[PDB]
Amino acid sequence: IKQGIREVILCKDQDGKIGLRLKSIDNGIFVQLVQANSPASLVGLRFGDQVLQINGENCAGWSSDKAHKVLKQAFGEKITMTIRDRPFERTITMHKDSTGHVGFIFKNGKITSIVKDSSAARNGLLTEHNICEINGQNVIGLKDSQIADILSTSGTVVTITIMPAFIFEHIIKRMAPSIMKSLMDHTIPEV
């Protein structure tokens, strides 16, 4: 989580696409969906990012449809957005026990239980939180099995980005769950 506002500059693809889906939360505008292999994925927009501006004009109070409308009508050689980094999320850093556990239980990507003497307990991991990222990778829509494997494949040190379930649910509506398994960029970032 970067604790300020950053700017990004977007360029429509061949198709006139930026690969981005926004959602009106609490009179902000927030990233509901980022498509793999898209300008938005390239410029490093993330699930749960706030869009403060688009081309200088402020996003306050705007409807999802409006924000989409604005992105369309704009001349696409250069779109400048102003982004607060995943405001609704935090990141927790755990260390696997020599059994390879960080030490929690989760179902549908929502952490349901924390285990005693676990790194997850020590680090103050919370339940009723939806897992958004692991080591930088968006894992939203992935089946619990696949998330489970990501945590398995990761090193000793694990990093989880989490989002209070009440908020996660509010964000990921107007979308099916295994649509998100498809559409949502789940790639490690390019460099």
Ligand X SMILES: CC(=O)Nc1ccc(-c2csc(N)n2)cc1
- Residues found near ligand X in the complex (CB under 6 A): 21, 33, 68, 71, 174-175, 179, 183
CB of 105 to ligand X, least distance (A): 29
CB of 72 to ligand X, least distance (A): 6
Q: Cβ closer to ligand X: 33 or 92?
A: 33
144 assigned to a ligand binding site: yes
DSSP structural state of residue 67: H
Compute the distance between CA of residue 31 and CA of residue 100 in angstroms, rounded to an integer: 33
Exposure pattern of 59-96 as b/e (b: 16+ CB <10 Å)?
Answer: beebebeebeebbeebebeebebbbbbbbbbeebebeb
**Residue, CB closest to ligand X:** 21
Whether residue 8 contacts residue 49, with contact meaning beta carbons closer than 8 Å, is answered with no
Q: Cβ closer to ligand X: 76 or 121?
A: 76
Q: Cβ closer to ligand X: 95 or 181?
A: 181
CB of 160 to ligand X, least distance (A): 25
108 assigned to a ligand binding site: yes
The pair of three-digit structure tokens given for residue 179, joined into one six-digit string: 């649509």
Residues tagged in the binding site annotation = 108, 143-144
